[PDB]
Amino acid sequence: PVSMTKTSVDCTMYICGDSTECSNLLLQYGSFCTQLKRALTGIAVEQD
Amino acid sequence: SKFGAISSVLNDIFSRLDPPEAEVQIDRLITGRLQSLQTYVTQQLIRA
Amino acid sequence: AYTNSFTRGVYYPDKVFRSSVLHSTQDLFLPFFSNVTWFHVNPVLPFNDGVYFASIEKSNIIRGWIFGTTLDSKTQSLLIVNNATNVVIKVTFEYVSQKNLREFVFKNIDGYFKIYSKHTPLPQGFSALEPLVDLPIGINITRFQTLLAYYVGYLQPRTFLLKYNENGTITDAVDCALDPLSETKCTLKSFTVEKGIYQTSNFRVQPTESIVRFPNITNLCPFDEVFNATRFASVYAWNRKRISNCVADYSVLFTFKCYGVSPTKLNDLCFTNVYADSFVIRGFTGCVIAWNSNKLDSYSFRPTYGVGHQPYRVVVLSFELLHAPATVCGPKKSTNLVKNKCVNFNFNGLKGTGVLTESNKKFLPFQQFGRDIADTTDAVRDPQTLEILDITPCSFGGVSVITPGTNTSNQVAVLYQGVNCTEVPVAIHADQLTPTWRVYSTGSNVFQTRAGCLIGAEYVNNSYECDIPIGAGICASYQTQSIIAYTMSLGAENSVAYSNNSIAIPTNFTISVTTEILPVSMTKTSVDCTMYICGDSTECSNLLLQYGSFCTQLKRALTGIAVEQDKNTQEVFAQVKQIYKTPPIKYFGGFNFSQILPDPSKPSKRSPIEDLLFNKVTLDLICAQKFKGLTVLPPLLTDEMIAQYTSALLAGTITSGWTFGAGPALQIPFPMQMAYRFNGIGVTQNVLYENQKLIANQFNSAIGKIQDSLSSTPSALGKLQDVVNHNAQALNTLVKQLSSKFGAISSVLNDIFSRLDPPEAEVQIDRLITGRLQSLQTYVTQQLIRAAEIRASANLAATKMSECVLGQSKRVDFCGKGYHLMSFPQSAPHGVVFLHVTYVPAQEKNFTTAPAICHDGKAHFPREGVFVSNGTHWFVTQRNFYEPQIITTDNTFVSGNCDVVIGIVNNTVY
Amino acid sequence: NKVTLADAGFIKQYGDLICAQKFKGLTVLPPLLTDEMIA
Amino acid sequence: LTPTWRVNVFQTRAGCLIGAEYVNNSYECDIPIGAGICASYQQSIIAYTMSLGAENSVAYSNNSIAIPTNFTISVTTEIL
Amino acid sequence: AEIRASANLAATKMSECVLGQSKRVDFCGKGYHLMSFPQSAPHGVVFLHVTYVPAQEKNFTTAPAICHDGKAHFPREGVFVSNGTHWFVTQRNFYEPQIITTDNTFVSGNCDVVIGIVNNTVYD
């Protein structure tokens, strides 16, 4: 094996799909979604 | 999964409960789903 | 008349002092480059959501304003005038208090009229407005008028990134929703963007309208026959009534509690199995309604009994909210059914947003809903027309921004990922395209890729090296003037002239010195768990002592990582038993090692190249981290010690070759060691000797270029800088996570403890503690993974030190591109740099070749070479350097006759 | 022909398992190098 | 102070070391302290700058070579 | 994952140190690797690396080439050494001086280019 599937996650869509109140609440959790996006982007670049 | 909440649907929680208890239930759901995302990303990092 | 607002109307969002920070604020602002209306000296302009008001005058024509809804006597209105002595405000409320550009901001939220202002000696500068006053006028304002060049702009809720000066002044701002570049700047929390492609946000089509679909029933439920019953049953023989096919209006309904539902919401939900149980006592999802029935009723209730023993009538309402077809629910007006359009929908309490279409699913009569693999609603039976509708979320997707870097240009391209250009969101209003900015199609600037639709770059038929990867073979770059997209080129095509009997032999060579950078260790970090989580709050510490050995595990893991870092450094650099020193006279047959050898003049005793490497890697933010309990432990080996180890390795290899790595160091002249290494790559020794000076010069040239190749290229030391940046970013993220509330009422523990009773303060503090503990655990897990990666890099660096520095390697590409001659280590802040000296053949020439030569009827094969020819005579030569020689019995061996070797060629063997 | 990919991360036009995952916010990004380029 | 106990005072980049006497001699690292400082038990606890090994100078010249006249068969152990 | 890396390294050493003789420096013990023997251990492996360590080094005077009859001679598979008066050719890793003959050297060019060439007799 050389590479694996490059995955992207829409954090807001997964956690709070279509619920605007849930996204407003999620805004108070800091940079969790940003950190997850950074990690997944690093993995994706590493595959290439 | 419900993670100890009344339901796994955010809209049902927001439509059935006042904000004081909706906060507890939505906190449980959001924490569970953030944990699921974090677990997925950690295992993706190890697999990568 | 209209004009450009430019970057004006920024005000201080709060009363907090900040300095030397980038702060994101979501507030009512004036968007950058807004079309502000311009009046010249007046009409009653609307007061939509707040107003920015500028005035360029020197005669005080403008005095004040009137605010109200109708500006008549029937509705209450506000009035503000600035007299030459004082400013008078009247509404039930009165208030009095104290070219030139006067800028003002007026807002009306929660019964508060807030006024900010600034004075300046529309201009094209940046100025931040300071607050003036909040007034509790308590009236809704929809219109206003100026009381006699003045400019009016309207505020909207925007997200802004404000930059605070060193003395706390807002000097710059970014309007996150202005355009893709500003969204990228807000995502990165920076004012400068480097070249690349950045995932900024997701576009989401917004719901056009809202629809409600409830059953057609209109009869009222028999609640009166339950609650207003003449006589209630007994608690043992409790009465039960079923409620079906009616409209339960709970407003008609003392103690009224509910389990699993809120009393203020029952009018909106649809219920399946409603049963009312009534009985009398003395003082599961559903509701309990109890009320004193003293004046209405064995207990043997009597009027002289107390409240604790007075009769109470009790009704229990039990219903199932596990959807299924709804027979009873409250007063809700159904709208029309909107299809093929993103709408907010409500089907008997099932709320959502999306597009509703005709469904081909073969439901069954009892089936009211359909679910997908994730147990989420996917099809719905319309309560009135009984038709099956598919629910699909309306269009959304990811957006990436391609920038050549803000240091070069402000032009950007936008990639809509996983979307064809025919489905790209094309909206003429702000009811779509969540980023809310627009990049319009101009024909040749819209391209389709298997990665999505790219807008803002023209696709050229040329092919270049990849500059910014888009995906699926497509890259983008700044042409210079515009952004171009293209198919990446894999390299220059080349055809090798193969034939039956043609061989290419090099006639010359190049001595190449190449660089390989390897991380060896990362920053050793320690965390004070209590100080991070609690930070001077003793009550928090006492609460934290009940979460077990979490901090003990984290301390153990971080200590293991810290020990592993020193182990990595030792395994890489501490390979030599002895500390070898170079001889006083630095003559090595013309080879010049001054760039890699230590310099006595420098206090650190580093080489010029090592000094360059330590200058090129950047190893109050530290104090801010320290105050939160995050510290950096010093490495065991100092930089001086690592440089001493490197000097010992270099002296050993220079003065003894590869012998000191396999035993006692055996001195050998450097040209003789170089001859050994030339022998190691299948080149005869004389080739080195007869070219000694030239070879030396080439090396002296190549090493001379190394400095430039590290001091001219921007990201030459990218890997070590990446290690440093990863550590700094992780610690900064840990620090910034302390401002998160995690659902609590504040992020400050001492604020929660000083304003709440312990029963609820415990809940809030538990939320904060769990959030911070999760942050610490995530940090430690990422540290463990990064430590594993760094350990792999350090093991590789130790292997390179053993096999490239302590010996000559025959492994292809392990110690440089060409044929490995030798290698030199140089210490770098968090790692090692190998200078690989390799032999690259050059200046090849064609020759005719044969497998063997027939002579006296015997087949002759070359001993240590290959047969070549000018075209008339036949020589034998070594394979990596053209040195033709007369074919004799001494450089040839005999095997068989010239009857089986295909390609054998007649010649003479002297 | 012997390895069956799941997504390959190419364009999905509005109109099975991949669709559900996408609706939950999970998407696959295409590799930079195509199969033809690697060949 | 939080530890509530009290305790030959030395300053290092790793912090304040109490209870160890800094000596000018250099030995192989026994207990790593940090930034080149190690500790050891001499009757007393000593702190010192760790040594990297014995200094050695190879007698290099442009016409001299050292050639072994004997050998030793070494058997070493590697545990994985 | 760490143990898997260790086990992959152990398998590589079993292949390259036990099933063959390795030229990789310090991969199969310190010194010039001769062979290796595996021994099982509770949760791992123990390699006994047998290596050749040179010892009892002696100083000699050396030359890149020997000039004879106007011809430059380079050692075929050795190095030129000298007691101080006579000149021998020896293998690099063990002192075995040999008479400099035309059968253990090879000729390349005159005595005008090689720096450090030394006059001596190349017996035929």
Ligand SMILES: *[C@@H]1O[C@H](CO)[C@@H](O)[C@H](O)[C@H]1NC(C)=O
């Ligand atoms: C901030 O104000 C101080 C106060 O005098 C001044 O010295 C400093 O230069 C200012 N910082 C700037 C202008 O960046």
Ligand SMILES: *[C@@H]1O[C@H](CO)[C@@H](O)[C@H](O)[C@H]1NC(C)=O
């Ligand atoms: C009971 O009767 C009173 C007066 O007739 C009325 O106001 C009230 O709404 C009734 N209660 C119910 C549950 O119908």
Ligand SMILES: *[C@@H]1O[C@H](CO)[C@@H](O)[C@H](O)[C@H]1NC(C)=O
């Ligand atoms: C996007 O839709 C158009 C219109 O049907 C179609 O021609 C095009 O092929 C689609 N995109 C892709 C990548 O197939």
Ligand SMILES: *[C@@H]1O[C@H](CO)[C@@H](O)[C@H](O)[C@H]1NC(C)=O
């Ligand atoms: C040599 O190569 C040519 C093509 O370049 C081919 O036609 C010929 O058959 C080859 N030689 C032999 C002996 O087949």
Ligand SMILES: *[C@@H]1O[C@H](CO)[C@@H](O)[C@H](O)[C@H]1NC(C)=O
């Ligand atoms: C080999 O290349 C060098 C340049 O590196 C040049 O000076 C020299 O003349 C070349 N030798 C031959 C024989 O072409």
Ligand SMILES: *[C@@H]1O[C@H](CO)[C@@H](O)[C@H](O)[C@H]1NC(C)=O
């Ligand atoms: C070695 O190179 C440096 C830098 O090019 C130069 O200053 C120095 O004189 C050189 N040494 C000799 C002996 O030529």
Ligand SMILES: *[C@@H]1O[C@H](CO)[C@@H](O)[C@H](O)[C@H]1NC(C)=O
């Ligand atoms: C060798 O021959 C091929 C074609 O036969 C030619 O393309 C190439 O340039 C030649 N090489 C040299 C060094 O002349």
Ligand SMILES: *[C@@H]1O[C@H](CO)[C@@H](O)[C@H](O)[C@H]1NC(C)=O
């Ligand atoms: C044959 O090779 C020699 C090199 O020794 C050269 O002088 C001569 O010109 C070559 N003959 C032809 C025909 O190229």
Ligand SMILES: *[C@@H]1O[C@H](CO)[C@@H](O)[C@H](O)[C@H]1NC(C)=O
């Ligand atoms: C080489 O010489 C022999 C001598 O008998 C002859 O038989 C053979 O045909 C020759 N080969 C070619 C290719 O002419």
Ligand SMILES: *[C@@H]1O[C@H](CO)[C@@H](O)[C@H](O)[C@H]1NC(C)=O
């Ligand atoms: C050879 O070494 C000696 C002593 O180490 C030195 O005096 C001499 O200059 C060196 N040879 C050259 C050409 O510099």
Ligand SMILES: *[C@@H]1O[C@H](CO)[C@@H](O)[C@H](O)[C@H]1NC(C)=O
């Ligand atoms: C070589 O060393 C061995 C000891 O390992 C010794 O017995 C022997 O005499 C030595 N031989 C020579 C020639 O020094």
Ligand SMILES: *[C@@H]1O[C@H](CO)[C@@H](O)[C@H](O)[C@H]1NC(C)=O
């Ligand atoms: C070789 O000579 C140098 C200097 O004369 C000396 O220091 C060294 O010990 C000698 N080596 C041996 C093995 O005697």
Ligand SMILES: *[C@@H]1O[C@H](CO)[C@@H](O)[C@H](O)[C@H]1NC(C)=O
């Ligand atoms: C020179 O070598 C010969 C061996 O043939 C012998 O005379 C002696 O070992 C050497 N001379 C000296 C002075 O060591």
Ligand SMILES: *[C@@H]1O[C@H](CO)[C@@H](O)[C@H](O)[C@H]1NC(C)=O
């Ligand atoms: C070696 O011999 C040549 C000619 O026979 C002579 O020019 C040269 O000086 C001799 N070398 C020494 C070191 O005497």
